[PDB]
Ligand binder design. Structure first.
Ligand SMILES: Cc1cc([N+](=O)[O-])c(O)c([N+](=O)[O-])c1
Ligand SMILES: Cc1cc([N+](=O)[O-])c(O)c([N+](=O)[O-])c1
Ligand code: NA
Ligand code: NA
Lengths: 116, 115, 115, 116
């Protein structure tokens, strides 16, 4: 799979498990079209969102549902979600890992981009 | 002002100057309505976006034009922009600082909410 | 003052108040000599650590007592402390801000070096 | 192995490869005794530093040689290194991943602690 999402919890020192993730792709009319969704596993990783064939060039938005995560654990966090928006595959196919480290009032995110 | 935005550059160890920032408020029909905007100053800060009277409870989005910032430095970045989405609550402390720390392939954001 | 330390709490979205900070300078024999210390204020900031005359070029260590901070909040943290080690250079901008953002199992640190 | 170190580069969007790492353990006389060392692989990971038998209770310091990393790439960074100091195994053996995300004037670090 050319798109993976990994989420860690900076309060517990653990993977962030069961985090809902929704991916969108910008359509020709400039709207966000639903593309794929899933939830992180016990390792904090979400695999299998898409395929090389379906992950064409485009502008993608990876929405990480951080508020639902913290609220499911009884914490009242600051952000509604974390959004990661990027152009993908504009120089040919690449593999993308979108990582995020969560705290109730802060998050970090980075990307690892590799050429298969 | 109840809302301030600060942007820092982790590559050069400096404020991120002249970064465009747009603030939106979520409307009843679930669309994003323009609310306020500006460019960060020489200190990386953007003051005066709004007033206590105008900054009512609701859901707000702060969009930071990180791509244009890096492109002006001759660096090709990963993200189209950085977006910070949050609910303003009256119960909470009154003043909101939204800080972002930028690298070409990474950003962090935190909220400092105080009296 | 050429050196300021700022500490923020990512769990509560607030300054980290009353955090002990110790600064050391590396001596010729490679040991760490005490240089300055204090506690962060209600704004999470520690000002007045040193002067331009005293802050000569060299290697400095800023140790932030993060463990005591979390323990006072009833939270068990991972790190013994956070340490920031850097060289002061005269060529560079004059004023150094060392910022740290704290969570129980994580911290970030950045330097803002300006004129 | 119960201790792993992973390092990423936030400028390049890639693993941080060939980063030197030195681990120390506080001795009874309060000095930092050398414990293990190595360098990150092409994946940004450093495996095999120690064993369950030799990784006893103690206070450990993981020194990540960030300045040498950036300088080997011709960048002049702010920090001399990144130091991660923690008590390990005080409630029995655990597995520790020490992660770090590097920029020239900033770094983040987190831990993932699991119970085998
Ligand atoms: C002021 C500041 C410092 C750091 N830092 O790295 O020390 C940060 O990460 C952030 N932030 O927004 O996440 C803000
Ligand atoms: C910083 C970081 C740490 C871990 N980690 O395992 O702690 C990761 O897996 C990743 N990543 O990209 O997948 C990044
Ligand atoms: Na192209
Ligand atoms: Na014990």
């Amino acid at each position: 799979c050319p798109l993976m999402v990994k989420v860690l919890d900076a309060v517990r020192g653990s993977p962030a498990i069961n985090v809902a993730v929704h991916v969108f792709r910008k359509a020709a009319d400039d709207t966000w079209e639903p593309f794929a969704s899933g939830k992180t596993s016990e390792s904090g990783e979400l695999h299998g969102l898409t395929t090389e064939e379906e992950f064409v060039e485009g502008i993608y938005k990876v929405e990480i549902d951080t508020k639902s995560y913290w609220k499911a654990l009884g914490i009242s966090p600051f952000h509604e979600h974390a959004e990661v928006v990027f152009t993908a595959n504009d120089s040919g196919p690449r593999r993308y890992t979108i990582a995020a480290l969560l705290s109730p009032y802060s998050y970090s995110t980075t990307a690892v981009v590799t050429n298969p």
